[PDB]
Symmetry: C3
């Protein structure tokens, strides 16, 4: 089964580095980067807003744990946003390519 | 961590950054979501009475838990200027445990 | 029930064309186009990076197959990134409208 992983990085340099690392290690098949986003959350009763690059990574269930572990390790921040969403269907050729890319 | 409620992602669109900021700030302050990502500069296409509408929107990605999702959807609906707001819940099947713990802690 | 389809297109014109076609055919209710993204993946041992428009289309489980096939047919690429994610819940009026809009 395939999955989508949502992760954020603090800047473009970091997003590139993260993607390059996990792609080289064959922990993900592909990564989409979307710069120019904003993340909002509370920290110690204050509304914080930070620039982020949204990442959308594609991998398989077999690799999801290892991918999260690698992203967490290489990410500069302590507790980065790392979430896995299930893929229930898709283009047969794409999903095969995704799986083959991690062999 | 046994005390964590399962997490979900909510995809919501807002018509502009003004509204996106307002929606996010309100639901975060009301502890109905833990975090929101805003992605401006998007376009939404859809038909309305035979017309292909093309509107500029902000894509929001909100994080919350399954126990809070309904209250979040209702708050977003109330605060959203539009009558038929695009608000969708996606399941999170796995995540980093520390992040999920923080997500839960933020709502409690 | 409802689903979202995550699809990428190589440019705005193509994303607009794809969305316009599947909306006219009532295979999707709506499409969000997010420009200013890139996609990273390995090809022939080399890290590639290409500009993409990220699409998020909304449809029902009843139409997802026809939607994937239509997107595949109209997409310029041989192996297009087309992925389906499940929607568990959503705005009641929105979901009603989504269902009503389809063929």
């Amino acid at each position: 089964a395939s999955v989508v992983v949502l992760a954020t990085a603090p800047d473009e340099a970091t997003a590139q580095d993260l993607a390059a690392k996990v792609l080289a290690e064959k922990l993900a098949a592909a990564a989409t980067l979307i710069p120019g986003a904003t993340s909002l959350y509370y920290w110690e009763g204050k509304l914080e807003q930070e620039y982020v690059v949204q990442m959308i990574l594609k991998t398989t269930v077999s690799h999801q744990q290892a991918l999260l572990e690698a992203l967490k390790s290489h990410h500069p921040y302590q507790t980065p946003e790392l979430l896995v969403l299930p893929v229930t269907h898709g283009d047969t050729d794409y999903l095969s390519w995704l799986n083959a890319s991690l062999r």
